[PDB]
Amino acid sequence: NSNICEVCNKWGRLFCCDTCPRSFHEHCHIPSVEANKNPWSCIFCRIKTIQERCPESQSGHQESEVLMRQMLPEEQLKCEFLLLKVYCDSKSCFFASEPYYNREGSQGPQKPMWLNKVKTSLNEQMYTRVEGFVQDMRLIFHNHKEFYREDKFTRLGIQVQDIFEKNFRNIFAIQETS
Ligand SMILES: [Zn+2]
Ligand SMILES: [Zn+2]
Ligand SMILES: [Zn+2]
Numbered sequence: 001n002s003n004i005c006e007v008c009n010k011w012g013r014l015f016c017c018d019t020c021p022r023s024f025h026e027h028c029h030i031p032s033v034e035a036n037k038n039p040w041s042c043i044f045c046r047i048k049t050i051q052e053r054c055p056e057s058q059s060g061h062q063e064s065e066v067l068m069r070q071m072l073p074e075e076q077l078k079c080e081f082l083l084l085k086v087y088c089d090s091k092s093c094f095f096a097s098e099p100y101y102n103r104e105g106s107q108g109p110q111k112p113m114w115l116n117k118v119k120t121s122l123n124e125q126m127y128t129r130v131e132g133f134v135q136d137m138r139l140i141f142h143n144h145k146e147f148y149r150e151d152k153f154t155r156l157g158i159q160v161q162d163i164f165e166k167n168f169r170n171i172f173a174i175q176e177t178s
Contacts, residue, residue: 007025031080062175086137141161
């Protein structure tokens with residue numbers, strides 16, 4: 001197995017996947033690495049299994065249909081994986097914890113949002129449809145763009161949103177378009 005965490009790329013107390021060579025810190029994996037279970041399969045492996053069991057799940061889908069799906073076990077897992085893919089980017093550090101807003105010439109957002117809040121919301125089964133998760137994720141980046149206005153720091157929001165959107169289209173097999 002790898003000797004660094006797949007998500008944060010650091011060594012430490014790592015849990016090893018039994019079906020692929022990835023490793024994880026306990027709370028870097030989403031969901032948090034399960035207490036017992038030998039063998040243990042990571043989320044990359046679990047997602048791969050879903051695909052392999054239902055190859056047709058990779059045919060193109062309309063975003064509007066994906067968003068109305070109820071958060072049954074497979075959709076819950078797919079949102080956890082998508083969240084994890086965003087944490088895999090080092091730029092996620094800017095969006096992880098609760099923000100605060102005190103900049104001359106801007107006003108903070110009406111509804112602040114951050115990754116760790118989305119992570120807690122998923123853990124607590126607070127989303128009933130995929131739309132709830134996706135709306136909160138997109139709101140993270142929208143709030144950032146609006147607050148930072150013309151500061152070049154706005155680009156971090158564009159960058160991490162692009163990671164989000166690419167992974168959303170991949171995980172939920174959104175129909176490719178120009
Ligand atoms: Zn880690
Ligand atoms: Zn694995
Ligand atoms: Zn099938």
